[PDB]
Write a protein that binds this ligand. Structure first.
Ligand code: NO9
Ligand code: NO9
Ligand code: ZN
Ligand code: ZN
Ligand code: ZN
Ligand code: ZN
Ligand code: ZN
Ligand code: ZN
Lengths: 236, 231
């Protein structure tokens, strides 16, 4: 089962949406984490010609259905696919809303294999990766601007990252924490030996991205990557 | 030991008409000699190897025993994760012109683990089975990724047309008190991965593993019961 058991910001139900680029938005949803209260989780929405592509669900099915409603209102293009960046509640908790809506879903093969143990619904389709971390293109059909990179084990063994081609943006998901972070967040499923190398591999994979989007903080500069790697260095 | 054969530092045990276990040893601080096992499979007119020995020299001894005892070409080797017992001899396989295969993740981890990457990467479906285009002409070798356990990258191999499945370092002996080296292990998912190996090869009666002699299926259920205690 699951381990879980302001300017420019647009409120839409209990979610928040922020435009990051002409064709890119950040979605934000909240879940109350006993003791510490509201935990934000961010993902992305990308307009690619006549299609919308989603990175990560919200925490819940009901929140994820609200992402689809927001897309209908603000973009009014069909959602061609969603890719989720590992098998934890914040990234995959809303899979049923996507499947209910007939949306094709993608995850790391390992995320799909771990999903039952992690209390998640598996995506319909599985990404695989080359030894250099880049997605095998046959497993990323019509991903368009989404450039998927497996950096190595870090936050989880299955964590993947996504560059948005033709923009300044790369999405570190839960691997990367912001440059102000006092900790690496939830290390319950982390690989402490390989985390630092995986963070640095993400930086090297998207060497010119200037806006680093993350699950649990607002977008940051590239300093988030180096600061995260140096915090991870101390886990070894 | 009666019936076992020696070549240099290597010991070979015939498990089935076309299958041998190779065993090599390394002195580990405060542990004395640690055995590591792999497999040699005769597949008609060619030989397939599962896992290197600890070192290049030991791995060359495997290849020269194969020449002496079997006298068929070695077509390919599959190595079952990026640790020295399984991939320490990659340079000897490459020098001998043997095609090498490992989990893509093993190849990605190899530099950090001080190992040499294989020439080819295996990838796996969500159900754990190797994507067939990545494992061309593997003959009787059936490669399964059971999930993270002993390491994130550990893979397993069934030998079609035999009683044998190879758990590598994921599976420990049915009398074991411990799961051996957990330094790189996934404590949450280990038990499920061990059970997934059992379910992938449900008819295998001889379970070969890295650090103990062949056992029955009891090794799978005992490993899972030990791993349940890690959670
Ligand atoms: C801060 C935080 O809360 C949760 C619930 C997670 S995760 N993605 O590990 O579940 C994290 C994280 O660090 O990613
Ligand atoms: C007993 C043992 O010794 C070593 C050196 C290893 S491994 N494969 O983790 O390096 C193991 C193991 O448990 O696999
Ligand atoms: Zn997570
Ligand atoms: Zn997270
Ligand atoms: Zn977990
Ligand atoms: Zn090992
Ligand atoms: Zn081992
Ligand atoms: Zn290691």
């Amino acid at each position: 089962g699951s381990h879980m058991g302001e300017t420019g910001d647009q409120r839409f139900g209990d979610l928040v949406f922020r435009q990051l680029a002409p064709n890119v938005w950040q979605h934000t949803s909240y879940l109350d984490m006993p003791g510490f209260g509201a935990v934000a989780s961010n993902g992305l929405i990308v307009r690619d010609g006549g299609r919308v592509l989603v990175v990560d669900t919200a925490w819940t099915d009901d929140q994820t259905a609200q992402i689809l409603n927001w897309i209908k209102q603000e973009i009014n293009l069909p959602v061609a696919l969603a890719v989720v960046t590992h098998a934890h509640q914040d990234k995959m908790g809303g899979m049923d809303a996507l499947h209910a809506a007939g949306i094709a879903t993608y995850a790391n093969a390992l995320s799909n294999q771990l999903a039952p143990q992690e209390g998640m619904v598996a995506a319909q389709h599985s990404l695989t990766f080359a030894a250099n971390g880049w997605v095998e293109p046959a497993t990323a059909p019509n991903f368009g601007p989404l450039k998927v990179f497996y950096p190595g084990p870090g936050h989880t063994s299955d964590n993947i990252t996504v560059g948005i081609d033709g923009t300044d943006i790369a999405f570190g998901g839960c691997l990367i924490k912001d440059s102000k972070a006092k900790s690496l967040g939830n290390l319950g499923d982390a690989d402490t030996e390989h985390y630092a190398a995986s963070a640095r591999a993400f930086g090297a994979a998207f060497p010119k991205a200037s806006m680093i989007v993350m699950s649990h903080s607002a977008p940051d500069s590239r300093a988030a990557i180096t600061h995260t790697a140096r915090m991870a260095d101390k886990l070894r």
